[PDB]
């Protein structure tokens, strides 16, 4: 659905900025590729172009904010959402033990270019840590990620 509040748009704009390194307002294969690799992925040039083509409404070879917004505004079916939420969990769960620790969260955010203090990360872990085991499992992950 697309009944996005200005607050949500601004939040997506900041997410867009993690990709748009030079801040020119467009995401190129180079930028998309850089982010994916810092996350442990290894895409080919063709795969990157194919990904951009999916949402390239104006055919200019790059992804601009309006296109990224429409990508994020799209609503998908349950069997798609569950799998995608699982794929997302796998990214943070570096050692793959089924849980997300403070170190792993900090690692993904640091590679993305965000500067987090030691306290900020631990504060985040405790907000999502429902069962109180110091870590974050899938259920707690889904709640924090999809919040708002």
């Amino acid at each position: 659905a697309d009944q996005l509040t200005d607050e949500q748009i601004a939040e997506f704009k900041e997410a867009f900025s993690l990709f748009d390194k030079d801040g020119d307002g467009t995401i190129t294969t180079k930028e998309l590729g850089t982010v994916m690799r810092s996350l442990g992925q290894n895409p080919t040039e063709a795969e990157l172009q194919d990904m951009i083509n999916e949402v390239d409404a104006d055919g200019n070879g790059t992804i601009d904010f309006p296109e990224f917004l429409n990508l994020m505004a799209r609503k998908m079916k349950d069997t798609d959402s569950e799998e995608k939420l699982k794929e997302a969990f796998r990214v943070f769960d570096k050692d793959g033990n089924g849980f997300i620790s403070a170190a792993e969260l900090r690692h993904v955010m640091t590679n993305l270019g965000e500067k987090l203090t030691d306290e900020e990360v631990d504060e985040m872990i405790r907000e999502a840590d429902v069962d109180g085991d110091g870590q974050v499992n899938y259920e707690e992950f889904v709640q924090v990620m999809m919040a708002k």
């Binding site: 997410a15 999916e54 990224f68 990508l71 798609d80 993305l112 924090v144 708002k148």
Partner: peptide, 20 residues
Amino acid sequence: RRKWQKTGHAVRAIGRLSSS
């Protein structure tokens, strides 16, 4: 504020672009 969510949006975008 909501840095975890912002970060999550980026990761989710990649998953949506990969289109399964």
